[PDB]
């Protein structure tokens, strides 16, 4: 638009130059083509999202839709600095295509106040690249299977212009990490599962006779005594953001940790159990959306080859990046070209308990459904397996 | 107060209560108002830093408006200072930003007292004499500096600060202070009063797995002498040696007890843990350390007082950390086990406290000018303590201090990140030759390409660096015209942001000197220069 608006962006989409993609031609037209016709697709306007939409509107990119389900919360304003005390409770998305939309001059982004799951084929289709930056594995497994889904395979082999390329990044405290996927040719996010469900989910055995920490306490209230006792009224759940309901649990879970012998349950503590807290600065999300950003001008443009998808970053002593090829598991459940091999309610386990898939509540089906839990007489029931860790139906045979 | 607590929550969880107020006390300066610094700043404004002040001399330019999220098309014309903070401002209310229409040469000219009212410093984007001349006035005046510049594609970051020590450093997975090797009397007690061999069934699947280890580690003793430091053979025994206190079904074959699975699989790093690390016995040894005076920081009086420790009371030995992992057993053992930790170091605490105050008394610097809090804090981390010392911005660039060893021997991968820093050099020096930067305009870059080759080679040998740098470099460096492109302003903002934190609340442990970044390639290193 106006005087050497985009002279930082330019350079490296007008020059020649040593270290330039293999498919790389210098053109004065590239940033225009980029402008006006790249589609990017954001995948969470919380955590790196806020980070994201900014990197992306500086570097040239107009056409960015954002989706998001979450609401603006007083907790959100240490990091995401596109929301205001204002806006506490109106959509994310929403805010932060308005927030960008004024302090970026000609950038079009387009907010959508959904969960990515709201949506299928058609619609995640229609772009280029789509950037996650979201926090939960389960939502990162479910793209990653919708992306999958929209390569199209010509007798065995896989056709590179059905590939969407799918930049994810994650953050926790002082660390981070990114990594560029590339559908049918790189590792996918189930490829290197032994990386992503490493979270925790106390043991009924230890919660319910067997407590050694406050966590184990808060844990115990929150999961069986509130659901048995329905302190706010019959069939009112658990509200974390709820004052008056953090209170309770703590109350409860002193009394609990009293009867141990077990110090340290506080009010503070109780709050990061019950929301499963993860702890978060601006400073990480910057870092880690900033590779992100990078690398989604690099596949746009040709400018450079991408990374060599996976970087690791750390920040608590001195400061390192670390990358590494994660490379693709010829026998994965969700990018491999061939139906799985195995060996009712035995095999609903091993798709379940099992590493190689971690599935969460499956469901199979015979050549007709059996177990469709998701239908509490879909237990009456008691291959083609489906899951909410994916859009599509894996081939079990 | 309480509005603060809601906002922080998801950092308070990282730095604390005392970190956050480390944070709301100080005042940082930001030099100059560009994508990096404005970057930087915006990661210091929204955690809440007590205060900032923008020094730019400058006026926003088509470019700054066209690559800074806190700069728009409406400012271009008017002082970069006063119009970034107009904008980082609107970050956190709770946050009082300022600035000065000036810059740092003029401010370096008249009042050079001036910079001595932060906590931190953060110069961006200045040329060598600039950085130089602020760097020698910082360092006399012990005012903490980080400088940061953004070229093209690499991100480049120097930290300059005397002395950094630190208590709390937050190691990442370190070994828990079991004391399997070195047990301490209620330790020894406490393992007694069990009996593996007679009890009950569920009280032996029960077990503190530390028990169990313990229980096992005294047999093995009392019989070879050994105690198992060889990885594959005698400690693989040892875990077979667990495996087989694993009591038998009714049908014979062993059951499942997943207990004796977390002594297996724990026997690897439990079996020695007891010793002081490298960097404690070198703060020990260190002579802020051992000669005391009246002027001696609170901190190696700390030092000093856990050193005395480790000679009486200790027996060689830190004090006892407290805590321990959990671990599969019932709430009774386990409480009763973790007790013995946390009474155990609160006596090795007490026992602190008296050769500091001691320590205090031989200088009668105060009765407690060091609140027990600072006490247990010191206790618990006593075996993560550091110090960072940075070279001054003069020895770097001195023609006999400089660190050629270190530039040389990386230079020998062709391809290794300090090229980069060199490139940096070599830019500025053609910088100075010419009064401007290279392949500003695309009709420059081949032209330029010779002239900073020669800026580099006379760089070199005035150093006596005989290094190989690849003609590629060169021509990458002209390529890049002098550009700050905004990600790459990001990615070293955060950096920064965080290592500023780590300075104002005293908690990490910084980088020792310079980080450079390739955003080309997406690698970095840190180097001692
Ligand atoms: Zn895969």
């Known amino acids: 638009d106006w005087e050497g608006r985009w002279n930082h962006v330019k350079k490296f989409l007008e020059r020649s130059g040593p270290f330039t993609h293999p498919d790389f031609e210098p053109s004065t037209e590239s940033l225009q083509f980029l402008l006006d016709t790249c589609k990017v697709l954001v995948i969470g306007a919380g955590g790196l999202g806020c980070e994201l939409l900014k990197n992306l509107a500086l570097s040239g990119f107009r056409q960015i839709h954002v989706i998001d389900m979450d609401t603006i919360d007083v907790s959100n304003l240490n990091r995401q600095f596109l929301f205001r005390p204002k806006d506490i409770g109106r959509p994310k998305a929403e805010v932060a295509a308005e927030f960008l939309n004024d302090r970026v001059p000609n950038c079009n982004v387009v907010p959508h106040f959904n969960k990515i799951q709201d949506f299928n084929d058609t619609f995640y289709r229609q772009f280029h690249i789509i950037v996650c930056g979201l926090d939960s594995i389960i939502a990162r497994r479910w793209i990653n299977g919708m992306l999958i889904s929209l390569l199209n395979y010509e007798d065995g082999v896989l056709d590179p212009s059905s590939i969407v390329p799918l930049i994810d990044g994650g953050t926790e405290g002082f660390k981070g990490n990114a990594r560029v996927i590339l559908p049918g040719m790189t590792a996918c996010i189930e490829c290197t599962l032994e990386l992503y469900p490493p979270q925790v989910n106390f043991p009924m055995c230890t919660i319910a006779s067997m407590p050694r920490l406050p966590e184990h306490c808060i844990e115990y209230v929150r999961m069986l005594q509130w659901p048995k006792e329905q302190p706010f009224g019959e069939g009112v759940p658990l509200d974390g953001d709820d004052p008056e309901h953090i209170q309770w649990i703590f109350q409860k879970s002193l009394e609990r940790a009293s009867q141990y012998n077990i110090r340290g349950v506080t009010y503070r503590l109780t709050q990061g159990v019950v929301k499963r807290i993860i702890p978060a600065v601006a400073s990480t999300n910057a870092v880690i959306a900033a590779v992100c950003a990078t690398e989604v001008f690099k596949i746009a443009t040709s400018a450079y080859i991408p990374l060599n998808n996976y970087l690791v970053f750390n920040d608590v002593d001195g400061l390192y990046t670390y990358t590494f090829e994660a490379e693709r598991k010829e026998n994965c459940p969700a990018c491999s070209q061939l139906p799985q091999n195995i060996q009712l309610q035995e095999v609903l386990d091993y798709l379940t308990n099992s590493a190689s898939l971690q599935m969460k509540s499956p469901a199979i089906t015979a050549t007709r459904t059996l177990y469709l839990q998701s239908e509490e007489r879909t237990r009456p029931n008691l291959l083609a397996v489906a899951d909410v860790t994916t859009p599509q139906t894996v081939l079990f045979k | ?529």
């Open chain 2, 1 to 529: 107060k309480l509005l603060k607590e809601q906002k922080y929550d998801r950092q308070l969880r990282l730095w604390g209560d005392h970190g956050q107020e480390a944070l709301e006390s100080a005042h940082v300066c930001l030099i100059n108002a560009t994508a990096t610094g404005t970057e930087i700043l915006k990661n210091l404004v929204l955690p809440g830093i007590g205060s900032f002040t923008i020094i730019d001399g400058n006026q926003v330019s088509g470019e700054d408006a066209g690559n800074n999220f806190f700069l728009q098309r409406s400012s271009i014309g008017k002082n970069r200072a006063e119009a970034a903070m107009e904008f980082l401002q609107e970050l956190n209310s709770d946050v009082s930003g300022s600035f000065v229409e000036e810059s740092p040469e003029n401010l370096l000219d008249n009042d050079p007292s001036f910079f001595c009212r932060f906590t931190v410093v953060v110069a961006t984007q200045l040329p060598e004499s600039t950085s130089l001349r602020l760097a020698d006035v910082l360092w006399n005046s012990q005012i903490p500096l980080l400088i940061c510049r953004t070229y093209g594609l690499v991100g480049y970051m120097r930290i300059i600060i005397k002395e950094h020590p630190v208590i709390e450093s937050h190691p990442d997975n370190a070994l828990e202070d079991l004391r399997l090797d070195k047990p301490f009397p209620e330790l020894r007690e406490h393992f007694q009063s069990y009996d593996l061999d007679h009890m009950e069934k569920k009280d032996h699947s029960h077990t503190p797995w530390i028990v169990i280890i313990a229980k096992y580690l005294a047999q093995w003793y009392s019989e070879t002498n050994g105690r198992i430091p060889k990885t594959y053979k005698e400690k693989e025994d040892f875990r077979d040696l667990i495996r087989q206190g694993i009591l038998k079904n009714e049908n014979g074959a062993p059951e499942d007890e997943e207990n004796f699975e977390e002594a297996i699989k724990n026997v690897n790093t439990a079996l020695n843990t007891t010793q002081i690390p490298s960097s404690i016995e070198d703060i020990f040894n260190d002579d802020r350390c051992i000669n005391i005076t009246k002027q001696t920081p609170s901190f190696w009086i700390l030092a000093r007082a856990l050193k005395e420790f480790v000679a009486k009371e200790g027996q060689g030995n830190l004090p006892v950390r407290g805590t321990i992992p959990d671990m599969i057993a019932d709430s009774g053992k386990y409480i009763k086990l973790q007790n013995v930790y946390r009474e155990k170091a609160k006596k090795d605490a007490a026992a602190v406290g008296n050769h500091v105050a001691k320590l205090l008394q031989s200088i009668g610097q105060a009765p407690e000018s060091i609140s027990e809090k600072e006490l247990k804090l010191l206790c618990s981390n006593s075996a993560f303590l550091r110090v960072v010392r940075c070279r001054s911005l003069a020895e770097e660039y001195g023609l006999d201090t400089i660190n050629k060893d270190e530039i040389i021997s990386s230079m020998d991968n062709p391809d290794n990140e300090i090229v980069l820093y060199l490139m940096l050099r070599a830019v500025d020096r053609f910088h100075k030759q010419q009064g401007r930067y290279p392949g500003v305009s695309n009709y420059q870059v081949e032209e330029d390409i010779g002239k900073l080759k020669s800026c580099l080679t006379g760089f070199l040998q005035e150093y006596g660096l005989s290094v190989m740098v690849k003609d590629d470099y060169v021509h990458e460096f002209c390529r890049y015209g002098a550009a700050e492109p905004h990600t790459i302003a990001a990615f070293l903002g955060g950096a920064a942001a965080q290592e500023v934190i780590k300075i104002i609340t005293k908690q990490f442990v910084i980088f020792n000197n310079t980080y450079i970044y390739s955003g080309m390639s997406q690698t970095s290193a840190t180097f001692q220069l």
